[PDB]
């Protein structure tokens, strides 16, 4: 019954042999990015309470924001106009997703229900297309693979693929032993990686339903998880105050992004289009740009009065939005 | 100013949405949010006369009380959300001495929590009637569950309800002092515990909350208005 410990060292020694060099010696000759100064370009002031989640549309002009007051507002970032304001049944909404099509948005929180909202009805009102029930814990994150499929993480230690039309869970991912706090879909959408309070990040296969690879670097809850644009590496934020790049093919950590001054946890993590910059929101009321290859802080987006809860980079890569408990979502170009 | 007929209409739509959001802001600001933390057998369900959400009104002030029983285990992840509530209403069953040490650990976790560091607690020792019956009956000794009780003496400042045996008064104040000891130990004045002895029969618990939330907001206002 302890063969599991034998398998555990076997996995460890296989990773040890593979890690011949460090990402930092390989990129030691690469010339750094240089200080990155990003000024706030837009400030969106529509939410009464703390902002917990934001998602960018494929167009990179529309963005949906969630607040603890119980409202989702779609913003035309370019003109700072409020396209739609959705009243929500539960005041507590911890996540918000935007469909790739733009036809639907989703939100979830302590309700334990993922509500999908049809933005484009003929009646002209935003109505809840479907309510998804089955998570026995808060829905920490949700991302739409398509208009009829959504992958939702939960505090019940289970993530789930749901067919929206049926309302049923096509697949359930039960490997984690701790509340899953974040999920990131790969660009291909074939595999998603989810980070839990078990200080472990697990890669899944949406089609198969199983955990392909488990990554164990952090010392505390993995608050955020982002996929590198290539779809072969991912970056995890944790209360450990450390961000850790992993490589799916090497099945091990490539680098760590920690500063001695930085001691607060990382609420959110994102990568720019080129994947060179690893933005990361911290509870110090500021976000810190990191050169992913060089592991060097290369900038700071300090314009917030409270915890930065969410950070998102437009698909185009033109801008970075940063929600915060101050109730102001700021766009940084 | 260089805005198309459709851009101007979109700006109007945004302004209409903004006015609705302002009407909502007034309701949100008027509502005082309270986190009903507690455990089963506390009786937290019936502390106020009026399960996740309950709305009352005292002196034309509306209070929203949230009981998040949906998620268990470490409550740390979901407590971060309620870092803006006016005051946590902790409810403890005085009768259950065995679970009382479990209750004192939850208070310590909540009082010393990173996000609830400025949130005052309105502790409500409930089922004081049960505790009185057990103390009078015997059989169950608060000394057995907690050794410090035999040394304890009723506080001189303590005011006893009429006719209450001195031992019942001593027991009630021993339970209260354990919760107070945790509060006094790790507080910078940022928040305070308001301990109130209550029973299932008592219907004055809504008034108690009113008076204690008036003190929390008062002390916050005093600092906010740069007076203290």
């Amino acid at each position: 019954r302890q063969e599991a410990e034998q398998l555990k060292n076997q996995i460890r020694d296989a990773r040890k042999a593979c890690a011949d060099a460090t990402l930092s010696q390989i990129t030691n000759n690469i010339d750094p990015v240089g200080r990155i100064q990003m000024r706030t370009r837009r400030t969106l002031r529509g939410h009464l309470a703390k902002i917990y989640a934001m998602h960018w549309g494929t167009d990179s002009r529309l963005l949906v924001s969630a607040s603890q007051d119980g409202k989702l507002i779609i913003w035309d970032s370019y003109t700072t106009n409020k396209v739609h304001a959705i009243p929500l049944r539960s005041s507590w909404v911890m996540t918000c997703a935007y469909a790739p099509s733009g036809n639907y948005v989703a939100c979830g929180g302590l309700d334990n229900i993922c509500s999908i909202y049809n933005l484009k009805t003929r009646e002209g009102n935003v109505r809840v297309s479907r309510e998804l029930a089955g998570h026995t814990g808060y829905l920490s994150c949700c991302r739409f693979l398509d208009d009829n499929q959504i992958v939702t993480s939960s505090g019940d230690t289970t993530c789930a693929l749901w067919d929206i039309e049926t309302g049923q869970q096509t697949t359930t991912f039960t490997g984690h032993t701790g509340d899953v706090m974040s999920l990131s879909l790969a660009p291909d959408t074939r595999l998603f990686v989810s980070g839990a309070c078990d200080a472990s990040a697990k890669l899944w296969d949406v089609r198969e339903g199983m955990c392909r690879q488990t990554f164990t670097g952090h010392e505390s809850d993995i608050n955020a998880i982002c996929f590198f644009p290539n779809g072969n590496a991912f970056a995890t934020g944790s209360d450990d105050a450390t961000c850790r790049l992993f490589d799916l093919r090497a099945d091990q950590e490539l680098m760590t992004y920690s500063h001695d001054n930085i001691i607060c946890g990382i609420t959110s993590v994102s990568f720019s289009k080129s994947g060179r910059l690893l933005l990361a929101g911290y509870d110090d009321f500021n976000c810190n740009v990191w050169d992913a290859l060089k592991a060097d802080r290369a900038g700071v987006l300090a314009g917030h009065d409270n915890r930065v809860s969410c950070l998102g980079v437009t698909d185009d890569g033109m801008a970075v939005a940063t929600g915060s408990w101050d109730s102001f979502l700021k766009i940084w170009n | 100013c260089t805005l198309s007929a459709e851009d101007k209409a979109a700006v109007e739509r945004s302004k209409m949405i903004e006015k609705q959001l302002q009407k909502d802001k007034q309701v949100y600001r008027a509502t005082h949010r309270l986190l009903l933390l507690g455990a089963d057998n506390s009786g937290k369900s019936t502390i106020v006369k009026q399960i996740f959400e309950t709305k009352f009104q005292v002196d034309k002030v509306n209070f929203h009380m949230f009981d998040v029983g949906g998620q268990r285990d470490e409550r740390r992840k979901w407590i971060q959300c309620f870092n803006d509530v006016t005051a946590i209403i902790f409810v403890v069953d005085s009768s259950d001495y065995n679970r009382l040490q479990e209750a004192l650990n939850l208070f310590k976790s909540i009082w010393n929590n990173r996000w609830l560091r400025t949130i005052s607690v309105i502790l409500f020792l409930n089922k004081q009637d049960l505790l009185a019956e057990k103390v009078l009956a015997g059989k169950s000794k608060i000394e057995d569950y907690f050794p410090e009780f035999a040394r304890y003496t009723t506080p001189e400042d303590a005011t006893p309800e009429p006719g209450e045996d001195p031992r019942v008064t001593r027991a009630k104040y021993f339970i209260r002092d354990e919760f107070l000891r945790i509060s006094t130990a790790s507080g910078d004045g940022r928040h305070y515990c308001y301990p109130h002895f209550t029973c299932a029969v008592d219907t004055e618990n809504a008034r108690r909350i009113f008076n204690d939330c008036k003190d929390i907001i008062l002390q916050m206002n005093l600092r906010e208005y740069n007076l203290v």
Partner: single-chain antibody
Amino acid sequence: DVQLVESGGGLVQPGGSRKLSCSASGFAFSSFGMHWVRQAPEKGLEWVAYISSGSGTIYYADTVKGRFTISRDDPKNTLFLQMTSLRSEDTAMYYCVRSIYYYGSSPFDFWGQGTTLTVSSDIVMTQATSSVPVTPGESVSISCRSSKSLLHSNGNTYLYWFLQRPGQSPQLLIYRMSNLASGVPDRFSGSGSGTAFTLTISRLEAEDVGVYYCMQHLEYPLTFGAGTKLEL
């Protein structure tokens, strides 16, 4: 379903006054700004008035300005046009059109059936071909021209195509020059050059027969073209 039935029209002696009432059912009337567009019996479409959601902006066509006033009862879901000093020119079928304006919205999406009234710096839309004979399975290119470039700085070309099938209310086909309205077959396509635009109807079907109107929304007064009939 979505409906904008309007009543209140009939024979009226000149200098008279009638109120036209569009009753909206099946949509959020308050959210959508409404417009009254009239079609003289032997002529084309002309924009009469615009009532914005919240009733905070009202625009009128110079021909009816002063004499006609447009109001909306949002609680009763009803649009009113109190027309006074009626002239013989006013005779026309009046259509109440809904228009929601948000980024990505399709304005002019739904038109009402129409109420008939019988009385006893404007951008100019030039549809050159009044008629174009066509047989099914062919591709036609109805073209419209504009006095000013409908392309704004925003990058949006505010040109809209509408098809009034015979005996039917006009229906949005193309919005903002290229975007195709919902429920609209893929055969239609909008191609434009700031000032000159063309609607390409491939594999024309017997459903396509009707008059095609090009309208500008760049500014008010909104101006429609004469129309181009497509006969089978």
